[PDB]
Design an enzyme around this catalytic site. Structure first.
Site, mmCIF file in Angstrom:
data_model
loop_
_atom_site.group_PDB
_atom_site.id
_atom_site.type_symbol
_atom_site.label_atom_id
_atom_site.label_comp_id
_atom_site.label_asym_id
_atom_site.label_seq_id
_atom_site.Cartn_x
_atom_site.Cartn_y
_atom_site.Cartn_z
ATOM 1 C CB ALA A 181 -0.874 0.006 1.243
ATOM 2 C CG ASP A 231 15.546 14.633 -3.898
ATOM 3 O OD1 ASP A 231 15.498 15.785 -4.369
ATOM 4 O OD2 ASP A 231 15.043 13.640 -4.465
ATOM 5 C CD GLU A 261 13.073 19.213 -2.928
ATOM 6 O OE1 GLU A 261 13.377 18.001 -2.970
ATOM 7 O OE2 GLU A 261 12.453 19.777 -3.857
HETATM 8 CA CA LIG Z 1 4.324 0.842 1.288
#
Ligand SMILES: [Ca+2]
Ligand SMILES: [Ca+2]
Ligand SMILES: [Ca+2]
Ligand SMILES: [Ca+2]
Ligand code: NA
Length: 483
Positions: A181, A231, A261
């Protein structure tokens, strides 16, 4: 002394493999102008030699192994990087490594995976029946072998990808499987912004989580890093980034300053990220960048009194890395929102001479950007260095704000005992110039101050009451300091 960060690269830095050497050669210059830390671009092997590093193939290949048709990365070899870091350290300049953990690109081969298409505007919504695809999820690192790490990647280490080799089609594919998921606690944009590009790492996978912490520690040790720049943070399970930073600090015993970021022009969402990462890392002040860009592009109509509205620096300066520009906001890039040239020095004065926030200078602003547009950022080092001098030698002591006019705003720093001649009076305007009387501190009474930027040639005499009448030209900046 005040700390100043420098992002050491721009989008169009050339793929000549000489960037690490350029950095080493620039070490003295950077130290002299006041840079105390440098954020280097991703130092590991990308999907190709020319990749800027944001399409990482092997995090354990710092331009050391024969992978992706090259040994060096776009920037150079591992040894050249270590030499650069050594030179910076010899000049008291720290180094923060870029950390790209959201995804992996350039898999060695495809693997049969059962997946389903999801709505790009709402990834929690499946849009097709589940079918078998050939996803590039097999990462074996043939050049590195088991050096440093014997971990090999397979489809079950990812949550999805955007390409099926069998049908040769692009879609946002979510993988089927036990416990599969989208990672939760990521930006809620598009329903769930876990997926961004390439093969999305599954941070619900215990082995992935453990291996990534191991890599972080290895990375910090291998390059003697002093910190990190994370990042695409809004696309990575927040609790994982929190734990990852904690793991590296725990193992190294070092501060390991980290800035994430988190790209969202929303103070509320940035606040949420700070909360979910237990305030163990800073974030770039995205709102301030947009406010500065707005002032630069509204033809004088921007209300300068609102420049700090909704900024991270105004609420949590301790967790804000202020910046004017970066490689994603520069001309032609994905997050294009360039601060116009005329306003750029004013923006730098705003982040460099004020007491709050950890400011960052952009390589592209200092040396110009090498894009092909007719609006590339010119080399502004001559306009920025005097402001860096102001920060290094004069931006100290009690601050007095005069952000009280829709065009002309200013602030003063009285200076303190850390430097006998410290203190400054700054003025910037997004429209017509003029003058503003400001309290510069009784401790500076009787002194004669001059504009360190050189934009104005007149001097200012501080009155017996510590007040001075400072001036600024149209759409300009002036920073007065003691002669
Ligand atoms: Ca996952
Ligand atoms: Ca992700
Ligand atoms: Ca205005
Ligand atoms: Ca003084
Ligand atoms: Na994921």
């Amino acid at each position: 002394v005040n700390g100043t960060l420098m992002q050491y690269f721009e989008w169009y830095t050339p793929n000549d493999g000489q960037h690490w050497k350029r950095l080493q050669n620039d070490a003295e210059h950077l130290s002299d102008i006041g840079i105390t830390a440098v954020w280097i671009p991703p130092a590991y092997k990308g999907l190709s030699q020319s990749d800027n590093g944001y399409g990482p193939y092997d995090l354990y290949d710092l331009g050391e192994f024969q992978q992706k048709g090259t040994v060096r990365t776009k920037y150079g070899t591992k040894s050249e990087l270590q030499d650069a870091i050594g030179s910076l350290h010899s000049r008291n300049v720290q180094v923060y490594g870029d950390v790209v953990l959201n995804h992996k690109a350039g898999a060695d081969a495809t693997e049969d995976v059962t997946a389903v298409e999801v709505n790009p505007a709402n990834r929690n919504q499946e849009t097709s029946e589940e079918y078998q695809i050939k996803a590039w999820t097999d990462f074996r690192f043939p050049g590195r072998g088991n050096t440093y790490s014997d971990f090999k990647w397979h489809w079950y280490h990812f949550d999805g990808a955007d390409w099926d080799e069998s049908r040769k089609i692009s879609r946002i594919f979510k993988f089927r499987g036990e416990g599969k998921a989208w990672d939760w606690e990521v930006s809620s944009e598009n329903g769930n912004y876990d997926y961004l590009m390439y093969a999305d790492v599954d941070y619900d996978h215990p082995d992935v989580v453990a291996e990534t912490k191991k890599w972080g520690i290895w990375y910090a040790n291998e390059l003697s890093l002093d910190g990190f720049r994370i990042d695409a943070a809004k696309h990575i399970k927040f609790s994982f980034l929190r734990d990852w930073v904690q793991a590296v600090r725990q193992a190294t015993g070092k501060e390991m300053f980290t800035v994430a970021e988190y790209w969202q022009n929303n103070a509320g969402k940035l606040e949420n990220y700070l909360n979910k990462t237990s305030f163990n890392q800073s974030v770039f002040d995205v709102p301030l960048h947009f406010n500065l860009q707005a002032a630069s592009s509204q033809g004088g109509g921007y209300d300068m009194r609102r420049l700090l509205d909704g900024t991270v620096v105004s609420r949590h300066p301790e967790k804000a890395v202020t910046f004017v520009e970066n490689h994603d906001t520069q001309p032609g890039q994905s997050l294009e929102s360039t601060v116009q040239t005329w306003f750029k020095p004013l923006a730098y004065a705003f982040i460099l001479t004020r007491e709050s926030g950890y400011p960052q200078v952009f390589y592209g602003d200092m040396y110009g950007t090498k894009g092909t547009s007719p609006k590339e950022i010119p080399s502004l080092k001559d306009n920025i260095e005097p402001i860096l001098k102001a920060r290094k030698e004069y931006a100290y002591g009690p601050q007095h704000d005069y952000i009280d006019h829709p065009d002309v705003i200013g602030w003063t720093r009285e200076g303190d005992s850390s430097a006998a001649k410290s203190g400054l009076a700054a003025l910037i305007t997004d429209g017509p110039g003029g003058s503003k009387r400001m309290y510069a501190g009784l401790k500076n009474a009787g002194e004669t101050w001059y504009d360190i930027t050189g934009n104005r040639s007149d001097t200012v005499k501080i009155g017996s009451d510590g007040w001075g009448e400072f001036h600024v030209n149209d759409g300009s900046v002036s920073i007065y300091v003691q002669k």
